[PDB]
Structure formats: C-alpha cells, structure tokens
Write a protein that binds this DNA or RNA. Structure first.
Ligand SMILES: [Zn+2]
Ligand SMILES: [Zn+2]
Lengths: 70, 328
RNA sequence: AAAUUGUACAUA
C-alpha cells in the first residue's frame, strides 16, 4: 500500500517508510530491513523472512513449561 | 446466432417491447444483454406479454435453469409471477432436484424459489431430497441450498436431517461447508432438534476448538446459545487459557468466551490469568495471538478486576511499548 | 533491540 509498515513501526525515516511495501505481488518479502534478518529459530531468510514473534516454530508454551522456566 | 440476436447484440431496437421478442427468447436468455433486457422489462405492461414470455421458456426451463444467464430469468419469474405460474414452474422441476441442486445456477434458482412459493409444494421438495444428506451438505452448492431451507421451512418437517447427523456432527462441524450448515441448524430449530446435536457437539469439544472451522461453531454457540451451554463450554477451558491464547484458532474462542459470561465466570477466568508465573504474562503480552485475549480482557471486566489487573502486568508494559499496542 | 498484530461463507 505505497508504504512499508515494518519500517514505519520501526520509526525509520519517512522517506524509507514510503519507499517500499512490506511484502510482494508474489507474496514474498520485500522490505530489505526484514530480508536481512536470519531467523534464530528456523534459519529462514529473505523471501520467507520474519521476526521471532511471528516465526512458524515459536513453540506453544504450556503451564508446566512456564514452571520449569524459573 | 439467428437474425434478431445479431440485430440486438449490436443494439438496433431502442424502443423494444416484450412482444417484440417473439420466437427468440430462448436465444435472448442465453445472451447477456438479452437476459438483462428481459429481466428489467418484466414489471410493467399487462400479464399477456408476461404470459408469452412464460410460454416461450416453459419449453426450455430445464436448460435455462442450468444456464448462466437464464437462471436470472427463472429467478425473476419465481419472484414476480402469479401463483398459477409459480405452481406451473414448480411442477416440471420435480424428478431432477438432485442434479438441479448439484449444478450452480439451478441451485441459485432453487434458493430463489424457497422464499416465495407455497408451504405445501415446499414440503414436496423437502420429501424429495431424503437420505442423500451426506453428498449434499458436503458440496459447494448443496450447502447453500440447505441453509436457505433451514431459514425458510418449518423445522419439524426437516427433522429427518437431525437424524442424518448423529455419528457425523464431528466430521461435519470440522467440514468447510458443513460448519455453516451446523450454525444455521443451531440458530433455526427447536429444543428437540438442537438437543441431540448439541450433545454431539459437547462430546468432541476439545479437538473442535483447535480446528479452523469448529471454532466458528463454538464461537456461534457462545454468542447465541442459552446461558447453560455457554457455561458448559466455559468450564471446559479452565486450565488451558495460556495454551489456547497462543493457538491461532482457539484464541478467538477465548475472546468470545470472556465477552459473554456471568460475573462468576469472568472473575474466575481473570483469577486464572492472574496466577501466571510472571514469564507467562510475558508470553501473553508478547505472543501474536494472546495479546488480543489480553485486550478483550481489559475491556469487559468489572472495575475491581480492572484495578487488580492494570497493576498485575504494569511492568511488562515497558516491554510492550516497542510494538503497535497503545494502551493507556 | 527482531518490532509487520490473527481464521470460512458461491453465478455476467
Ligand atoms: Zn520496510
Ligand atoms: Zn523462523
């Protein structure tokens, strides 16, 4: 939509915000800031790149897991 | 094409009237501009011309209904015609309602008829389609028809479907088209028809919420069913709020659970999410789905839980500012 | 610093 949300919520300068979109006409990833990032969980990069909270392997956290982490 | 359709597809008759369409409506209803013209100029004049159009198409009804453009014609007739024509059409349709419901345009027309015809002929069509419930609900076109019937017919006549569902309510509440049929069932039936299906649902509640279609069934029972069913489902979640607010489908079920509830249920669940081991609150505010549960909890709670919650996760706010969440 | 907030409902 004529601008990239990621670079906007990341408070990049306004020129960068309106200089690209987040994803693609092919539904790849377009934002270079997000394409540079390698996922520490699933290694994916570039075309399928994503941040940690939205990673497809971000594991379901149970109660007992929340107890062990203490 | 013949002569007249090549004359009108180029538009050479700016003052055309219904009577001018003689001996070419079968070909006009198969052309776009012609079906639009016949469709839009069938509200004025007398019924004599409308009787003509009825006669010239009662010979090709079985094809105009399975026609991409004729189906609007058949529809408009079922909507605007004198009851004699309603019955005269209604007659020759029986004997093929299976096929005519499986086909796109024919089933559009079938739907269009069930809102204007007589109840008796309606029930004739009802008794027509017994048993095939399987192959019909599990179809891209049969399910829409089924829904229109659930909206327009007497529940007691349809009760046989209530008996074709036992042993199948699960594999259909999880079906992409069946789930809509089940929602229509629950929103348009009696106590004695919802009761067995509602028990069937309360059986497979667990696996249903984590399914991308059963969760619409649950969500539909939570904001439309009786308070009792609401409580019955509300209790079968206590102990799993953290595990489910992380699930993509079940999280909406959590939201629609905290919205519709009594003071004891709301307070009970708020208490469940108050005893979370600090880092599980971090899972809440952080995870992509739970935070919705968090906010819908912030908006609907009583002020006691409010002030006993604005503080409960007030530190994690600092770790939430760098997101998109502007929460005062 | 890893920040984008989330699932269904058919004919020119
Ligand atoms: Zn960007
Ligand atoms: Zn990943």
């Amino acid at each position: 939509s004529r601008h990239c949300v990621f670079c906007e919520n990341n408070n990049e300068p306004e020129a960068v915000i309106n200089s690209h979109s987040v994803r693609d006409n092919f539904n790849r990833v377009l934002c270079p800031k997000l394409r540079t990032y390698v996922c520490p969980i699933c290694g994916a990069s570039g075309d399928s790149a994503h941040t940690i909270k939205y990673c497809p392997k971000k594991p379901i956290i149970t109660m007992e897991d929340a107890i062990k982490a203490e | 094409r013949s002569r007249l359709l090549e004359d009108f597809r180029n538009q050479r008759y700016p003052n055309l009237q219904l009577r001018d369409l003689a001996n070419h409506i079968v070909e006009f209803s198969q052309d776009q501009h012609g079906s639009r013209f016949i469709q839009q100029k069938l509200e004025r004049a007398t019924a004599a011309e409308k009787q003509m159009v009825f006669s010239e198409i009662l010979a090709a009804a079985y094809s105009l209904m399975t026609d991409v453009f004729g189906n609007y014609v058949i529809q408009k007739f079922f909507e605007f015609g004198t009851p004699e024509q309603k019955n005269t059409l209604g007659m020759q349709v029986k004997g093929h309602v299976l096929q005519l419901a499986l086909q796109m345009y024919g089933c559009r027309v079938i739907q269009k008829a069930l809102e204007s015809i007589s109840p008796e002929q309606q029930q004739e069509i009802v008794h027509e389609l017994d048993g095939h419930v399987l192959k019909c609900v599990k179809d891209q076109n049969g399910n829409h028809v089924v829904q229109k019937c659930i909206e327009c017919v007497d529940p007691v006549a349809l009760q046989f479907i209530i008996n074709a569902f036992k042993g199948q309510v699960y594999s259909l509440s999880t079906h992409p088209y069946g789930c809509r049929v089940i929602q229509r069932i629950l929103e348009h039936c009696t106590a004695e028809q919802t009761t067995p299906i509602l028990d069937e649902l309360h059986e497979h509640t667990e696996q249903l919420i984590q399914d991308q279609y059963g969760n619409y069934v649950i969500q539909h029972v939570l904001e439309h069913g009786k308070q009792e069913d609401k409580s019955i489902l509300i209790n079968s979640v206590r102990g799993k709020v953290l595990v489910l607010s992380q699930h993509k489908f079940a999280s909406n079920v959590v939201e629609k659970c905290v919205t519709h509830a009594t003071r004891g249920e709301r307070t009970g669940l708020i208490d469940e999410v108050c005893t979370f081991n600090d880092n599980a609150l971090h899972v809440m505010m952080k995870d992509q789905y739970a935070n919705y549960v968090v906010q819908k909890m912030i908006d609907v709670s009583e002020p006691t839980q409010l002030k006993k919650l604005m503080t409960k996760i007030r530190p994690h706010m600092a770790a939430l500012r760098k997101y998109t969440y502007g929460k005062h």
